[PDB]
Design a protein around this ligand. Structure first.
Ligand SMILES: *[C@H]1O[C@@H](C)[C@@H](O)[C@@H](O)[C@@H]1F
Length: 437
């Protein structure tokens, strides 16, 4: 059992009220908004297929050039109340915002750098207005923060000389300063979601990542901290050298989700997936025809998937340069909200139900031991196979929307056929089971 000073802190899942709230929220939205939204995946006449928020890299734009985009930052359509209404209508319970992405441009007016919203034509504290607006709607706010900072000349990818170490130490102090500022300026913050912490420079300073977590937990009662931040004494990331999870929840899943049959280990900790609507675009890219774009049903499936295996799911948005959302994102939020309004009882405050996975879709467990069947794949047999854990019976099945009673037939030991509804709902639907132990 390797000794470590900067490994895991939490034993199992936190069950203080703040973490229960983080968990029970379940469905979140992500905001990627920064200077990259201006060029929108395109530099000086050449469109790049890579992720838009990383365009500075793909086009090899020097920091001094990249940051002049600040002079163009003027989102006249921006309206925080509207953003928050969109999120309320979508059924999102929390929103994660990029405070500062790799590019280093801050969405709040930081004291520790000129590269902020303050020194743009728009001037205003975007982050502050979002915090206020989402909170007004009863919506928690989480802070995405990139440790890697392409606008700070003290950042290092590795520590190779005395000179590197001098610069990076000062950079860690700079970073500390920004984090402390975020924490005291916006004390309703409920989560810090770190990114750009993979570089050798960070791995060699695991102590700093443990310090970062502890500092923020001291300034912000019950704040959550993602695993992506954390490196142990040896530079093992996410999970320490003893296989123990660091931070408060796992945050490696994006693009992929854990297998509902093979990866039930995820149910032993809190975790959160974040996903993009196209294949790999977080910030606004002007040309969505470049890769596969997920449909609403596809996204809702990933949402229910995550919850059925005891995880959060967060749907990304990359707002336009003008401060409005592309119509594909508006339709996504609207379609999701319509579904959530009919079926959210099976998502909010639900968890892993402990049943074997079946082809028609996913189970979730409600807080009062309700067991929802969420059907994405409608069997031609007109029967939904339910195999119960040892000790468990099905007493009733009810179509959530109508309250209509659903036929349950015992087929064998620990197994039932639950009938499809008499009329096909025509969309992914929920059947709620009443169970006895
Ligand atoms: C960190 O991960 C996601 C959420 C994006 O912000 C990506 O650009 C970055 F590398």
């Amino acid at each position: 059992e390797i000794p470590l000073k900067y490994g895991a802190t939490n034993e199992g899942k936190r069950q203080d009220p703040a973490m229960q709230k983080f968990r029970d929220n379940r469905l979140g939205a992500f905001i990627h908004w920064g200077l990259y939204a201006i060029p929108g995946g395109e530099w000086n006449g050449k469109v790049y297929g890579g992720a838009a928020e990383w365009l500075k890299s793909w086009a090899k734009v020097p920091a001094d050039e990249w940051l002049k985009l600040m002079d163009q930052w003027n989102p006249t359509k921006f309206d925080a109340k509207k953003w928050a209404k969109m999120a309320k209508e979508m059924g999102t319970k929390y929103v994660k915002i990029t405070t500062k992405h790799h590019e280093g441009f801050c969405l709040w007016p930081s004291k520790y750098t000129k590269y902020t919203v303050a020194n743009t034509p728009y001037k205003r504290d975007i982050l502050g207005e979002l915090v206020k607006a989402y909170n007004d709607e009863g919506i928690d706010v989480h802070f995405y923060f990139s440790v890697m900072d392409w606008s700070n000349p003290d950042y290092r990818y590795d520590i190779k000389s005395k000179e590197d170490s001098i610069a990076f130490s000062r950079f860690l102090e700079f970073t500390d300063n920004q984090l402390k500022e975020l924490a005291t300026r916006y004390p309703t913050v409920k989560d810090f979601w770190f990114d750009g912490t993979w570089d050798a420079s960070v791995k060699k300073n695991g102590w700093w990542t443990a310090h970062a977590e502890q500092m923020l937990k001291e300034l912000v009662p019950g704040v959550a901290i993602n695993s992506r931040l954390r490196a142990d004494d040896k530079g093992k990331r996410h999970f320490d050298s003893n296989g123990r999870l660091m931070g408060d929840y796992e945050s490696g899943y994006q693009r992929r989700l854990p297998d509902p049959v093979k990866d039930l280990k995820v149910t032993q900790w809190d975790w959160e997936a974040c996903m993009t609507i196209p294949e790999n675009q977080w910030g606004y890219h002007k040309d969505w025809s470049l890769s596969y774009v997920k449909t609403p049903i596809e996204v809702i499936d990933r949402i229910v998937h995550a919850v059925s295996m005891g995880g959060n799911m967060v749907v990304n948005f990359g707002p336009q340069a003008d401060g409005d959302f592309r119509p594909e994102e508006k339709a996504m939020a609207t379609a999701i909200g319509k579904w959530m309004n009919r079926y959210g009882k099976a998502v909010y405050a639900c968890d892993y139900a402990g049943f074997e996975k079946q082809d028609w879709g996913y189970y979730t467990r409600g807080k009062n031991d309700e067991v929802y069947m969420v059907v994405f794949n409608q069997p031609y047999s007109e029967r939904l196979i339910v195999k119960t854990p040892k000790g468990i019976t099905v007493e009733k099945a009810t179509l959530l929307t109508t309250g209509e009673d659903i036929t349950v037939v015992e087929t064998t030991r620990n197994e039932y056929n639950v009938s499809v509804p008499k009329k096909n709902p025509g969309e992914p639907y929920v059947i709620q089971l009443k169970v006895r132990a």
